[PDB]
Amino acid sequence: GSHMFLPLYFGWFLTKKSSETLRKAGQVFLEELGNHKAFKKELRHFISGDEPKEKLDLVSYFGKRPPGVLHCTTKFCDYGKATGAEEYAQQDVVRRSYGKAFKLSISALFVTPKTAGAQVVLNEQELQLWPSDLDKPSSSESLPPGSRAHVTLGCAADVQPVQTGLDLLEILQQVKGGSQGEEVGELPRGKLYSLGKGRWMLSLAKKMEVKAIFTGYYG
Fold first, then answer.
1. CATH number of the structural domain spanning residue 74
2. Per-position DSSP letters for 81-95, written without gaps between them
């Protein structure tokens, strides 16, 4: 009926000034934490590279793409091809939320070899923006919900789409059972919890609140 253009997915972009504040905080949080006494002394213990890699700076490894990009990808519409997006797209809460600005709330920061970001808590706004399709996890075993409760900040050259999916969901499960976060990194603004023999997390003392705007981007 008309020649108009539509977005690919809904999300909250990090309002530049905020994007930067969060991009630096997180980026530095990774390098500062990476240079921990426990980490430095466990450099080999964590990565046994006595030939292939005997000096791989985390900053360069877990920080290839420009950190000045902070965007929360809520639900992907995929040009309304994925089906369902349309039904939710009309959501009075989401549809009306678009264009409005809101600050994000991060409880802790996550670090990974090829992934790294901040944990966002779903409140009333995110709750209403939660479709009834995301109610049941992947296996449908009451797995820890919150597939959107994860914002991207840093990723390596090996940042695989399948790795981030499992590592994100699995890691959420362990932490749910109170066994995923060993205090092995003291931070003036909080502490670092080992999110698993391979992952790390940082619990903010005053959380990380940034200014974002709800909108949909296609390309």
1. 3.90.1740.10
2. TSSSHHHHHT-HHHH
Count of the separate structural domains present in the chain: 1
Confirm if 214 and 203 have CB atoms less than 8 A apart. no
Domain interval for residue 55: 1-219
What is the rounded CA–CA span in Å between residue 204 and residue 109? 7
CA distance 145 to 131: 12
Residue 148, both tokens: 């959107």
Residue 136 carries which side chain, given as an amino acid letter?
Answer: K
Q: Which residues form the catalytic set?
A: 71, 150
115 is known to lie in a ligand binding site: no
Among 85, 72, 111, residue whose Cα is nearest residue 8: 85
The structure was resolved experimentally with NMR
Those residues whose C-beta lies under 8 Å from the C-beta of residue 209, and which sit 6 or more positions away, are 103, 104, 105, 106
Instruction: Count Cα atoms within 13 angstroms, Cβ side, for 98.
Output: 15
Handedness of CA 187, 190, 195, 196 (dihedral sign): positive
Q: For residue 40, what are the contacts with CB-CB under 8 A and spacing of at least 6?
A: none
CA 22 – CA 3 distance, rounded (Å): 38
**Is 152 annotated as ligand-binding?**
yes
